[PDB]
Amino acid sequence: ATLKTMNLEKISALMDKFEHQFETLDVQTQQMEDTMSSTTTLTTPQNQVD
Amino acid sequence: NMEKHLFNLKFAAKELSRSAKKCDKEEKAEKAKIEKAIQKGNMEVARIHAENAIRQKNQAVNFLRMSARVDAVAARVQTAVTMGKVTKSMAGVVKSMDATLKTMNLEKISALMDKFEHQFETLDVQTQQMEDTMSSTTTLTTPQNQVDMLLQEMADEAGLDLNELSQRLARLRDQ
Amino acid sequence: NMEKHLFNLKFAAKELSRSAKKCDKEEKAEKAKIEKAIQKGNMEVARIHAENAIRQKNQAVNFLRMSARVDAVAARVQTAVTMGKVTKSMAGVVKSMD
Amino acid sequence: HAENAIRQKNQAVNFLRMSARVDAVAARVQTAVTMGKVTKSMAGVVKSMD
Amino acid sequence: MLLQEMADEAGLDLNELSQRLARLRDQ
Amino acid sequence: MLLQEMADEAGLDLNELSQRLARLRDQ
Amino acid sequence: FKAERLRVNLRLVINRLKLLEKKKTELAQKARKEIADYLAAGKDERARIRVEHIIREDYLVEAMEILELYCDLLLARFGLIQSMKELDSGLAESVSTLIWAAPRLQSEVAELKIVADQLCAKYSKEYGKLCRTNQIGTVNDRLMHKLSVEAPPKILVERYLIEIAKNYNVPYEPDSVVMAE
């Protein structure tokens, strides 16, 4: 029953989708972090941290 | 459903192992009995106990091999069950992430973050102006000269260090 | 919804790790048994216990690798869940501030 | 076990940086909330005094 | 199209020309 | 291999080709 | 015809062939031991049947290796499949063999039939089940021999038995009638 419902084609497609979705999430995280950092730059000067 | 079958398989394997152990023990006992009977001279009882001992030995070996086979099958089925749970969870995660990334995509997220940054920059400007005004409201209760003098006195008392003109300006204004 | 799937994923990873530990222990026991059987002279029982030991070793390694993979996936999904909460909160904040 | 250790190290560093970013954002939002309360109170005071 | 999409999503299987015909009609 | 090692360690006793077969298959 | 379907089925066929050849090598070791045991006794005409089984399985493993090679070749030149409409020379052998061997190994590897479908539904020049079987006269002859359903040569069986006996420390007197002719 299971391998009829969840076969190799569907599993492979689902996993490609998982990978692509979390890559997109990797991109979203990077951009979101760039912006989060750009928001607060006068409270954390690079010179002071160095 | 499959978890019940896995449980039954592992139970059967353990039962086979227990039976093999018990049969080995019974063989060890029947060897004592055959020794006794061969001492007493009983040939027929010795034959009976030898048959029993050989049978117990062979059936113990068979039970052991059988339990090994069932153990392999049960390990495989347990792997399959765990991987099925994992696959179901990852399918659910894929569905949820698909819905979300459809609603909250990279375009919308980037625009929302640009908006967040700009709104809080505007708030930075509002805070600065609001603070300028708050300070301008209360300037006769907090004279700059008095604060400077207090800091100088506190420093000089602590021994450490910290890291009039209006008349000249008026004379210059008179020209 | 996704939190439930994350919970199930982490549970499966922990189960795989436990199973790998148990299989390693069973291998250590079957080695004792094969030593005993090779002392008694039983060649067939020694073969059986050797098969069991090798199988337990290999399946323990497989369970360990599998649990590592599921752990990576679950960490990624947990990151995604937390970041989704953060993104939702920041969207709400953006709306209110607007 | 080496793969696991390296992965845990890297993901711990990532979680730490991520938590720092979210901490900055949350501090900014808390400042905004407090200043919004202050601004609302001062608007009410301005109305009453007017 | 709906059947093809539903099949491909389920992973299973199920068990343009007008322009060529018009060009043929032009002769 | 495990049985051979365990035997040799216990000092007792118990009572490659594929390449040659492939070369033979090539004929 | 669907491209991504063909891609996924090719990857699945590759993985399945890997697993199958592995486990078939293992089973071949075990059954070779069984044939050695058979030769230990006086049973000889039966060990010939067993070794026929063995060499059939070995031909099959070699054919599966070749098919895995060809599937990976198609998978490496997949864009060249999508771009053109008629297959080039570099892909003639792969397509031909994967269409010809699919019904042969359809039971072992199921996805291979889907691969054959996608490769028959994409072409019309001498294509289609009927024309696909008619234009199958360009497949790898070696693979045809590996998957040839025929009684292997007797001398080859004698050589297989000689080697197995010599390895398993068992005496064996080959049939001189075939061993010398």
DSSP string, D1-47: -HHHHHHHHHHHHHHHHHHHHHHHHHHHHHHHHHHHHHHHHHHHHHH
- Is C85 strand, coil or helix? helix
Q: What is the DSSP string of B22-40?
A: HHHHHHHHHHHHHHHHHHH
Distance CA B27, CA E23 (A): 92
- Is B154 strand, coil or helix? helix
Distance CA B94, CA B83 (A): 16
Distance CA B69, CA C51 (A): 10
Mutating which of C69, C77, C82 best tests the D interface, going by the most D Cβ atoms within 10 A?
C82
Task: Note whether A12 contacts G111, CB cutoff 8 Å.
Answer: no
Q: Resolution in angstroms for this experimental structure?
A: 3.1
- Beta carbons of B97 and A21 less than 8 angstroms apart: yes
- The answer to whether G164 faces chain F, any CB pair under 8 Å, is yes
User: Between the CA of residue F6 and those of B25, C30, C50, C56, C59, what are the distances in Å?
Assistant: 25, 12, 10, 17, 21
Neighbour tally for D1: CB within 10 Å = 7
Q: And the tokens for E10?
A: 């389920």
- The answer to whether B113 faces chain D, any CB pair under 8 Å, is no
- Buried b / exposed e along E1-27 (16+ C-beta atoms within 10 A): eeeeeeebeebeeeeeeeeeeeeeeee
Distance CA A28, CA A44 (A): 23
What DSSP state is assigned to residue E11?
A: T
- Beta carbons of G40 and G171 less than 8 angstroms apart: no
Nearest Cα neighbor of G167 from F17, E14, A3, B21 is F17
Helices then strands, each counted (H, E), chain F? 2, 0
- Is B41 strand, coil or helix? coil
User: Between the CA of residue G118 and those of A4, B68, D37, E16, G66, what are the distances in Å?
Assistant: 21, 44, 67, 20, 20
- The answer to whether A5 faces chain B, any CB pair under 8 Å, is no
Chain A, nearest residue to E13 by Cα: A9
Nearest Cα neighbor of G161 from G178, G137, G149, G142 is G178
Distance CA B156, CA B141 (A): 24
Neighbour tally for B168: CB within 10 Å = 9
Distance CA C50, CA G106 (A): 36
User: Which amino acid belongs to residue C74?
Assistant: A
User: Which amino acid belongs to residue A17?
Assistant: K
Rama region for B19: left / alpha / beta (φ>0; ψ in -120 to 50; rest): alpha
Contacts across the A-D interface (CB distance below 8 Å)? 20
Mutating which of C30, C36, C38, C51 best tests the F interface, going by the most F Cβ atoms within 10 A?
C38
Query: CA dihedral in degrees (B101, B103, B105, B110; nearest 10)?
Result: -140
Count Cα atoms within 13 angstroms, Cβ side, for G58: 23
Distance from CA of G135 to the nearest CA of E (A): 25
Taking the alpha carbons at both ends of chain B, their separation in whole angstroms is: 102
- Stretch (H or E) spanning C67: helix C43-97
- Beta carbons of G173 and G164 less than 8 angstroms apart: no
Nearest Cα neighbor of F18 from G68, G62, G6 is G62
Distance CA B16, CA B74 (A): 13
- Beta carbons of B67 and B20 less than 8 angstroms apart: yes
User: Which amino acid belongs to residue F16?
Assistant: E
User: Which amino acid belongs to residue G175?
Assistant: D
- Beta carbons of G115 and G9 less than 8 angstroms apart: yes
Task: Note whether B75 contacts C55, CB cutoff 8 Å.
Answer: yes
Distance CA C5, CA C11 (A): 10
G158 Cβ neighbours under 8 A, 6+ residues apart: G174, G175, G178, G179
- Stretch (H or E) spanning B107: helix B106-137
User: Which amino acid belongs to residue B138?
Assistant: T
Between helix G45-76 and helix G3-40 the angle, nearest 10°, is: 160
Phi, psi torsion values for B143, nearest 5 degrees: -70, 135
Neighbour tally for B172: CB within 10 Å = 8
Nearest Cα neighbor of G1 from G102, G82, G109, G95 is G82
Nearest Cα neighbor of B94 from G134, C21, A24, C39 is A24
Chain A, nearest residue to D28 by Cα: A40
F5 Cβ neighbours under 8 A, 6+ residues apart: none
Distance CA G20, CA G9 (A): 16
Phi, psi torsion values for G53, nearest 5 degrees: -50, -50
Distance CA B124, CA B107 (A): 26
Distance CA G34, CA G16 (A): 26
Between helix A8-39 and helix G3-40 the angle, nearest 10°, is: 130
Distance CA G63, CA G42 (A): 34
- The answer to whether B127 faces chain D, any CB pair under 8 Å, is yes
| Residue whose tokens read 């089940």 | G129
CA B58 to chain centre: 48
Angle at B84 between CA B81 and CA B89, to 5 degrees: 130
Does F touch D (3+ CB pairs < 8 Å)? no
- Buried b / exposed e along G37-47 (16+ C-beta atoms within 10 A): ebbeeeeeeeb
- The answer to whether G75 faces chain A, any CB pair under 8 Å, is no
Nearest Cα neighbor of G136 from G96, G80, G173, G107 is G96
Count Cα atoms within 13 angstroms, Cβ side, for G52: 13
Q: And the tokens for G173?
A: 């007197």
Distance CA G58, CA G32 (A): 11
Distance CA A24, CA B33 (A): 76
Task: Note whether C46 contacts F12, CB cutoff 8 Å.
Answer: no
Q: And the tokens for B5?
A: 């079958």
Distance CA B94, CA A21 (A): 8
SS (H, E, C) chain G: CCHHHHHHHHHHHHHHHHHHHHHHHHHHHHHHHHHHHHHHCCCCHHHHHHHHHHHHHHHHHHHHHHHHHHHHHHHHCHHHHHHCCCCCHHHHHHHHHHHHCCCCCCCCCCHHHHHHHHHHHCCCCCCCHHHHHHCCCCCCHHHHHHCCCCCCCHHHHHHHHHHHHHHHCCCCCCCHHHHHC
